[PDB]
């Protein structure tokens, strides 16, 4: 199961100044980058074009190229329409794409956030606000749904273009997506012993403090932290009374090793 995400951030400082930047994820790997500074979307992978022909992509990029300009002007005007309801600074986010399932099936989504709160989605054939949104947004929504052409285009994006594009990506991207990178581990202690695990891919991993063949239940797993080279980092902490560090090790299981658990003794 893979989730394709197009993540948009737009910041509107005042009525004149704004910027819009997007990044594109397929799982936890970045496939595209589109900075406000750039006229074109950049591939961050060799296979980011997926299975589209150059002509198909040229046409798809130009559609976004037109959207970014429009989006920017639209928000700006939607503010003039509500004013003095809402005021700059304004923060818009969009999250769009699809979750791919086996065979043919998928679900496409397009969620919109305003000042860090989820407020609008495209669902079916129209824009709609979600529960908890403010009533004033009903006028923005009445306007956006006025626009038949945008509707047809967005339904195509979500219903047809997304799934097709990604099924194409998963073929071209198979190599990087199924990559196996080994973790490397090291130990240290602060006034609690720490087991550092770094470099593994994929994300699923297991790390425990052990004395022989017994687990240590206090083991507090951290969050997954990313490296710059698209591998993962995580650490485990266990509280110890001073002197008890003897006979302790840190055991790490991961898909990359093939049952060759990492065994670091203190």
């Amino acid at each position: 199961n893979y989730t394709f995400r197009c993540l948009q951030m737009s910041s509107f400082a005042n009525r004149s100044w704004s910027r819009t930047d997007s990044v594109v994820w397929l799982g936890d790997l970045q496939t595209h980058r589109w900075s406000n500074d750039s006229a074109t979307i950049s591939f961050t992978k060799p296979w980011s074009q997926g299975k589209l022909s150059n002509q198909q992509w040229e046409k798809l990029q130009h559609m976004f190229q037109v959207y970014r300009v429009s989006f920017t002007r639209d928000i700006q005007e939607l503010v003039k329409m509500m004013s003095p309801k809402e005021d700059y600074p304004i923060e818009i986010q969009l999250s769009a794409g699809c979750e791919m399932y086996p065979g043919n099936a998928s679900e496409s989504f397009l969620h919109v956030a305003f000042q860090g709160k989820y407020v609008v989605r495209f669902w079916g054939t129209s824009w709609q606000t979600v529960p908890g949104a403010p009533s004033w947004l009903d006028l923005p929504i009445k306007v956006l749904n006025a626009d038949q052409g945008t509707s047809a285009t967005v339904q195509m994006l979500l219903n047809d273009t997304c799934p097709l594009f990604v099924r194409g990506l998963l073929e071209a991207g198979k190599s990087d997506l199924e990559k196996q990178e080994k973790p490397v581990a090291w130990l240290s202690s602060v006034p609690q012993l720490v087991c550092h695990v770094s470099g593994f891919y994929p994300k699923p991993v297991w790390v425990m403090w052990m004395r022989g063949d017994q687990e240590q239940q206090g083991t507090h797993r951290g969050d997954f932290l990313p490296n710059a080279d698209e591998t993962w980092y995580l650490q485990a902490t266990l509280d110890v009374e001073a002197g008890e560090e003897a006979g302790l090790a840190c055991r790490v299981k991961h898909s990359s090793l093939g049952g060759q658990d990492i065994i670091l003794y203190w």
Partner: T-cell receptor
Framework: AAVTQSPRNKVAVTGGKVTLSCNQTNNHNNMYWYRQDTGHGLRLIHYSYGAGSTEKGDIPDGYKASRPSQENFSLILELATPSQTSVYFC??????????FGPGTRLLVLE | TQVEQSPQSLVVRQGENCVLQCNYSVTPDNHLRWFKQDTGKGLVSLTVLVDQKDKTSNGRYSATLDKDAKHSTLHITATLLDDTATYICVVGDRGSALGRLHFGAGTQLIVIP
């Protein structure tokens, strides 16, 4: 879906106050003031998204707007100049793309 | 400017047909509208074209739009004296109130009766 403009014709002097007015009983939220001069297409001056809102258009300079009610949209020239001789058109609309235009108002400003 | 009309002006004898052109650079281009304006008068809408390659008609006026070429032509068939008017081209940014209209300077028609 009708739009009324008054006056339909005005003769004004330089530096004098001229107020063109536009009225629509359609309950349209949105209204727009244009001018038409030979060899240019219509040009937007000011517009509105409702009572109390006025918005600069493309050539706002020399013009002030006023939306005192849903029904009325007024273009005010505080200090009229000869370059403001034109035919002025008012429009209104709901959320849709269609703008319904009034019959136009001719103004002449003389020294 | 972003919307250009041709010919600037033309003279025809009644009964004859004429072709009027609109060429634009507007983006995006939701819809295109052709107006008829009698001298010292108002904007009467003739037709509005919406689709990528679109064709419309209205009595003696027929029109076509091509959004790739970004071009529209308006055909008047069998001209009548009344057709003496300026014909005006307009392109719409959006399919909603959020859009701005982009006006041509017109084509002036004279029909000799």
């Amino acid at each position: 879906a009708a739009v009324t403009q008054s006056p339909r014709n005005k003769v004004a002097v330089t530096g004098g106050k001229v107020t063109l007015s536009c009225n629509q009983t359609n309950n349209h939220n949105n209204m727009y003031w244009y001018r038409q001069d030979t060899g240019h297409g219509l040009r937007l001056i000011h517009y509105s998204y409702g009572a109390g809102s006025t918005e600069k258009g493309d050539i706002p300079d020399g013009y002030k707007a006023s939306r005192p009610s849903q029904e009325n949209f007024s273009l005010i020239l505080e200090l009229a100049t000869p370059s403001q001789t034109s035919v002025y058109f008012c429009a209104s609309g709901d959320e849709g793309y269609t703008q319904y235009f009034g019959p136009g108002t001719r103004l002449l400003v003389l020294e | 400017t972003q919307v250009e009309q041709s010919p600037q002006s033309l003279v025809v004898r009644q009964g004859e047909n004429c072709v009027l052109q609109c060429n634009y650079s507007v983006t995006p281009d939701n819809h295109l509208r052709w107006f008829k304006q009698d001298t010292g008068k108002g904007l009467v809408s003739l037709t509005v074209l919406v689709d990528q390659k679109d064709k419309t008609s209205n009595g003696r006026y027929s029109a076509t739009l091509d959004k790739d070429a970004k071009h529209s032509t308006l055909h008047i068939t069998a001209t009548l004296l009344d057709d003496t008017a300026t014909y005006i081209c307009v392109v719409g940014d959006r399919g909603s109130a959020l859009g701005r209209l982009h006006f041509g300077a017109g084509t002036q028609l004279i029909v000799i009766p």
